[PDB]
Ligand binder design. Sequence first.
Ligand SMILES: Nc1ncnc2c1ncn2[C@@H]1O[C@H](COP(=O)(O)OP(=O)(O)O)[C@@H](O)[C@H]1O
Ligand SMILES: Nc1ncnc2c1ncn2[C@@H]1O[C@H](COP(=O)(O)OP(=O)(O)O)[C@@H](O)[C@H]1O
Ligand SMILES: Nc1ncnc2c1ncn2[C@@H]1O[C@H](COP(=O)(O)OP(=O)(O)O)[C@@H](O)[C@H]1O
Ligand code: BEF
Ligand code: BEF
Ligand code: BEF
Ligand SMILES: [Mg+2]
Ligand SMILES: [Mg+2]
Ligand SMILES: [Mg+2]
Ligand SMILES: [Zn+2]
Ligand SMILES: [Zn+2]
Ligand SMILES: [Zn+2]
Ligand SMILES: [Zn+2]
Lengths: 333, 334, 362, 365, 364
Amino acid sequence: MIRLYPEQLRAQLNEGLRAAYLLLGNDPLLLQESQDAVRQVAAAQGFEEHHTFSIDPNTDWNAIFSLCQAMSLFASRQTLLLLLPENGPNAAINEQLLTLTGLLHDDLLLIVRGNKLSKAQENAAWFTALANRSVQVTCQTPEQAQLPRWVAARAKQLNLELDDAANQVLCYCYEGNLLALAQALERLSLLWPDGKLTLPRVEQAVNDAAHFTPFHWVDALLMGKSKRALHILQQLRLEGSEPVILLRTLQRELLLLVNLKRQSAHTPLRALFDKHRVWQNRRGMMGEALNRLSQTQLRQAVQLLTRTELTLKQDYGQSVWAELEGLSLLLCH
Amino acid sequence: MRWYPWLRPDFEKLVASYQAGRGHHALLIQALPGMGDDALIYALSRYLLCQQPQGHKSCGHCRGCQLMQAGTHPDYYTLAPEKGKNTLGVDAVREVTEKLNEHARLGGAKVVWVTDAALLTDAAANALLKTLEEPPAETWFFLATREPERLLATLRSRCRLHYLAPPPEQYAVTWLSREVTMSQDALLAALRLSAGSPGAALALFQGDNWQARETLCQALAYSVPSGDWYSLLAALNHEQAPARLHWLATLLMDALKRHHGAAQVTNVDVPGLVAELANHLSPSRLQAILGDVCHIREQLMSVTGINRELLITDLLLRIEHYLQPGVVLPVPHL
Amino acid sequence: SYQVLARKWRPQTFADVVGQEHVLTALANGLSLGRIHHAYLFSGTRGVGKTSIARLLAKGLNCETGITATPCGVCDNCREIEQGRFVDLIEIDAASRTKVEDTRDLLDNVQYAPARGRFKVYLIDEVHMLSRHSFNALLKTLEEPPEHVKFLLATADPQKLPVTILSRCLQFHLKALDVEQIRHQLEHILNEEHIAHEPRALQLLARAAEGSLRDALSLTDQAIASGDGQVSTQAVSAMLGTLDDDQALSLVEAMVEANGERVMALINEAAARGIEWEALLVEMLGLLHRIAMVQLSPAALGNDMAAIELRMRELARTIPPTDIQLYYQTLLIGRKELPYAPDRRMGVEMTLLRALAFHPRM
Amino acid sequence: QVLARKWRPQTFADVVGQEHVLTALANGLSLGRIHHAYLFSGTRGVGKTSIARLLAKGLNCETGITATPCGVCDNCREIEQGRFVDLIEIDAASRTKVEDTRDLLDNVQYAPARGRFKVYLIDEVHMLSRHSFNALLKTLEEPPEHVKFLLATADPQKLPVTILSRCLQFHLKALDVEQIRHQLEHILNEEHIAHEPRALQLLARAAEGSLRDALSLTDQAIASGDGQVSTQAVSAMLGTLDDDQALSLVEAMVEANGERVMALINEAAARGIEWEALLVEMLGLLHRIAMVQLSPAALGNDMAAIELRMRELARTIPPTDIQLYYQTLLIGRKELPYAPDRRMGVEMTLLRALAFHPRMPLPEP
Amino acid sequence: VLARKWRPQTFADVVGQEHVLTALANGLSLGRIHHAYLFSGTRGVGKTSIARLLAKGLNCETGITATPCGVCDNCREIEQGRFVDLIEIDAASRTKVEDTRDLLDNVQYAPARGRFKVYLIDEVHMLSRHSFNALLKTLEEPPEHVKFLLATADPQKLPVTILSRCLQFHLKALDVEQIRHQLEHILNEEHIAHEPRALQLLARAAEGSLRDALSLTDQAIASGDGQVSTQAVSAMLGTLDDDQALSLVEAMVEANGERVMALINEAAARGIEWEALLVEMLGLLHRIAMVQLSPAALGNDMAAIELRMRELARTIPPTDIQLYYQTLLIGRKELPYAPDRRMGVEMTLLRALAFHPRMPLPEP
DNA sequence: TTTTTATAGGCCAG
DNA sequence: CTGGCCTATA
Ligand SMILES: Nc1ncnc2c1ncn2[C@@H]1O[C@H](COP(=O)(O)OP(=O)(O)O)[C@@H](O)[C@H]1O
Ligand SMILES: Nc1ncnc2c1ncn2[C@@H]1O[C@H](COP(=O)(O)OP(=O)(O)O)[C@@H](O)[C@H]1O
Ligand SMILES: Nc1ncnc2c1ncn2[C@@H]1O[C@H](COP(=O)(O)OP(=O)(O)O)[C@@H](O)[C@H]1O
Ligand code: BEF
Ligand code: BEF
Ligand code: BEF
Ligand SMILES: [Mg+2]
Ligand SMILES: [Mg+2]
Ligand SMILES: [Mg+2]
Ligand SMILES: [Zn+2]
Ligand SMILES: [Zn+2]
Ligand SMILES: [Zn+2]
Ligand SMILES: [Zn+2]
């Protein structure tokens, strides 16, 4: 099963089409763009009839018996699309899929959209026997690390020339929202046919529209980057995040910090992370935190996070967002 | 739902008034948990609904008694909370207040049992007000609480109060000795933990509960000398926290009582833990900590949805701070 | 056809109403002057005549005899209101029918003229519970009703109404009923009912009414079951939780003497006698008050204390005024926070314990 | 009948205050510069609904678009009786939904039956669903020549910015003690009702800025005082006591003399005066005093009969001392609910005052 | 009305927005027309005005052009209101699906006057899930003779599945000068007197919107009886002040007790809820105390209040800031007990003042 | 790996 | 007019 990054797809769909095209990921643009790159080349291989179908656990055993039937020869080539649930392929749908795996024609082309799969979900028989036939496209979004490369890359494919500094400024503004980063370039190339995107030129044509998850925030706190935090808060507001969610995710971590910091006098740092099942990529970050924050700061953070929980659910208060701006600063000294 | 012997005379006095037809349409009984108000009421309910009453007694063989006997009797409304929840909402009241205008669906009396008035939402309470002041005829209300003073002002004045006082301590301990086999000192504490209520007492021995007090006590026996009170999280952080916090409250208080050389303590069965509190903590801090431990307990009980772990954790981290010399301690307000 | 006193004795003519004389006056006064408003709002604590009076004003507007301030109670129209059956007094349980959709119906049926009465009178009771949207729906109509329409709002908790609603109403704030007011009324009722009573037990009941006639009547009906038929001094006092004067002072004393072992040991015998904790705290607040008073002028101690006066004056002389205020303060806050602590007993224990450890200054 | 309703101004002349709104409108009608969305805001009872209707009356007056409608032509009189087929007074608080707003819109296109303009006056407009706000957006930005929108509301903040940017906002100010007073007098005179000049100052104040609150208050004054608006009546109803007895106890307090404090309380007590009430007038005085200290002219216009003494107190007592007396009398209030006995509590509060008095504490043992 | 009259009918006539216009210009110019544009930004900054220009320049009788002529039958026809092939849907009053399905049944038939059938869907954030789905189907398979200009001030509400099918142009808020200049232009052309600083005061009050600006002017022109004076404008804007709480912080720190008690009076007219003033103050104090820990603590949000705020931060002692703060929170805790909510706020400031560290209150 | 609750008001498709 | 869905206020 040829795994691909959306950029690479265009080329390996020109080589050979394959009976199954698996579009998996989270990013709304990498999905649409991949989706369309396939539908486009299918019309162009004789495909007229295109059918779509969102698969809830709602699809009856009569809705999946009108899909298996949806492929009989000889009809002008047809492109059957399937959309997926939050969970992915459940035990009910894990089996419906198995029924489609052996019905494959040059006449029927399978396209499947949704999130990433649990490892034993991917390893469920039907999927690996599709394997040598199918193509699979990673649609996960790039993170604050991997992102600039993806930009300087797209920048080039649109033959625009981006500066080290202009790259930096797009990535700041559009992190986590590629669809806006993408139009960002589209808009800039209409702006200047040159193709040369000096910093100050690109500066004037930008608006601030990042999308974070509450996780992004705790991370910035853990690594003591405060200006970053505050940006994350301000965006988390305008997206209208339930602040209750922020409280609870800050807490899973802040209470774990309290508890590590104490024991860290008795047992080595490393054994503690193990003790607690601390995801590996998180572990260096954590230590950073544990080093900068006193056993007191942590306590003050706990008291202050508590005042804002009461202030929220008892006092029905407004404060909350600003109390978190301040909590955020406290954890960065 | 059990019936306890100390109900006989309270029941016999309350039925009387009913038997004369001069019963009050809105009786609010106040009883500790486990005092058996639920059974006292049932008795009163059953009597009101039986069509062939043998004096105080419900006969068992009339249509009414049969239906009652089998869950379903059209004219008995139970207002407790939805299964998942811990409040008793307004919509639930409004069904009952409406259906109550329909002629009795079996042409008898209609009785409404509100299990715990404390659980009436503010909105639920008021919705109950006009129907409660002047119900249709042959309608009979029963409500119960721990604490009438926590109850909406206007709801309170439409009821008649009946107080379910608990039996003498001696009686209750002799009651208990026949239900569980524990040390005399044990019973006595369980009973005293439970404000006098046998059976609320008895309930401590039944659960996982007493095993968990011993765990609190073990843990406490360690935190005191060492100053590690965050160590208590594990024995307190549990859904039963309000109760266990109250256990901890009474220990702190018993220590405060010894600093004053008082005869009764509450935790009669653990006089060693009590002494060690007295020894390693100043009056000033025993008292302050008692303050906070209660205050959180309240919040834990009275703030819908509040996060237990965070609150207990902050309470423990903060107690440790009080332990330090010269820190400024809390003093009640207003 | 039995009913609780609280219910039977609802005043059925202005003449039968206890106190509230400022409301009754402006009402009778405006009815006579011809100055009849369209939106009367009636407020006060529980059970002091709010909705009893609304209902009286309604008989008065619709009475077959004429618009009167002294309604007969003997025409189809006053009888029907007495019994709730009167078609042109629409009584709304606002606390139940809180929704806008509901109150918008109310309005759609205002335009229509009265059935058999002279005015269509809406009596919206417990009005503080109408939703925000309900309150505003009423705004335009409440300010500008049809000439045949009158609004009578009653609520115990008027803070909760928008200020736009208040702007448009005449607000009558019924006072709490005076201790004697409540008492004379208790006497009258127990007399007409033909029930035996002892003067001093009416005293205890009025005090305990805590300002409210309904409260008072409910306690009385409780006396009458507890008492086997009589409302005697002996009975009421057992029921209410009343104190024998010694026990309270003894505690005040042990408290200021920083005598821990005794304050606790003394609360314990109180616990056994089954004392009402809020009463203790209150009686205690009361003695602390005398004491602090006497310290001002010696003659401020009552005739009523004779058996105590020797112990009072001492406490007055010994204890500094400053230190008595901290005692009063501390037990006051303690009463406030009483119903929140895990027992009622435990609350008195935390309260006195706290107070205990004041004694030495420096 | 009812004052608050009878006296709704029927010409601009009759409107109290709001010069800045009245002037602008009038300056604009004759100026021929006339918006299509006027928005009126400010607290209850300040004249927004009645101005709105006056504008409409002026827009359609058979004499010409004029700032001084004639109050006699069929249109003028008809608008006054609320039955003019081209002033559609919309009760936004009942027509809140979209499907309602949509009906209002559907009938916008259609031309007026009798007047120059179809005027929608959308009152209590802050109640409109979010949906029905946006439904208004485009029609409110670009109406037909013969349409005008008069929105009015108690609180404007509820309105989406997209609505606001589209209309002229006239925020009517709440009214001065003096402005209210003058009106209360005018009306009582015209209505032929005996009154004591101070009962008016007292009402104008209790009115807390609202001219309606004022009239509502007067109405029940007329009833309470039996056809007379008398000072005894008014302060009865307001729970004020006539000002000497409150002040006299303050003074007694600052002067540390207990005997007189207690006496003055015993005297408060035979009158039966309401205990929280008293505590309040005292903070009420302690404040104006702390006030007068700060800025001198700041002492009220209501207390002429007491000023000699008030002035004196501000002079002689240190601000740090006064903040103390207020503090103390305040928690006294906080405490009153819980004190054994509402009197006892007020008594005990002043005893705290004396015990902690700064200049002459109560005698230690 | 000024807001209506001066709506740009030419690209030249448009204030700012140069990063949208230029891209539109060049796209028309260089043959790059997307099938769907989405115009966003705040109230009254040019969103729909530009939508209507893209339409003129899309159908001009001269051709497809950045410089539409505004005079041909098609250009005055659109300027007017009735152009047969400019279908401007008011999507807020027509949001149900029935209505959107019917709009789209005619999408297929060709345009009966100009080059293009232009659907101009305004305040589009209001359409239902289902009206979006239906719109989407037509934007996924755009007819050739059809273009779609979508405008909303709040784009966050459109599905991601639509945002992904439109080139979205986010209009900027207009700068104080940008607004000031247009004010001057217009007021002059209409032949109306004005003082330099009256206009500077208007533009500032507009809070970045060219409509909120012209609306503020029209009203100004009234209070001035035909003249726009500083004497006059300053008046009217004081009528409409949000100001009162930020202003009291400034006037509190400076110990100016007349300015402090006159602002409290200004607050009473605007008709404030008192516990609310207090809370805006505590809340300002907090916000400032944090722009003491970093500059980044002032929001995208704050802009018009902003300049004032950074200066308040610099020129104050942070041990003093938590001093005032304790006093205001207490005044709150005290306010329901203070005799008059007003009196409460007053005595809370009067307390703030006498216990002022920097310039205390005079004692006898 | 993402969360308070009780009551209310409201919009929409079919 | 139902059931799904969203939202604001305390
Ligand atoms: N002023 C009064 N005079 C006589 N009885 C009263 C008075 N106030 C209350 N009551 C008694 O209280 C009962 C309930 O009174 P009600 O008028 O409903 O009080 P509320 O203000 O709480 O609605 C009445 O039926 C009557 O027995
Ligand atoms: N400016 C004013 N001049 C004269 N009377 C007023 C004024 N404002 C309020 N009133 C009185 O109060 C009544 C209600 O006024 P209204 O204008 O409806 O207030 P609102 O602004 O809250 O709608 C009026 O009929 C009038 O008697
Ligand atoms: N860039 C601009 N240039 C000139 N006038 C503008 C500009 N932006 C807004 N306006 C003024 O505001 C009025 C309405 O603008 P509009 O573009 O409809 O705002 P919206 O983005 O909210 O739909 C226009 O008539 C114009 O007078
Ligand atoms: F019981 Be009442 F209506 F306050
Ligand atoms: F009485 Be107003 F319209 F608020
Ligand atoms: F027309 Be705009 F969005 F105010
Ligand atoms: Mg009532
Ligand atoms: Mg109005
Ligand atoms: Mg627009
Ligand atoms: Zn039976
Ligand atoms: Zn009659
Ligand atoms: Zn006229
Ligand atoms: Zn042209």
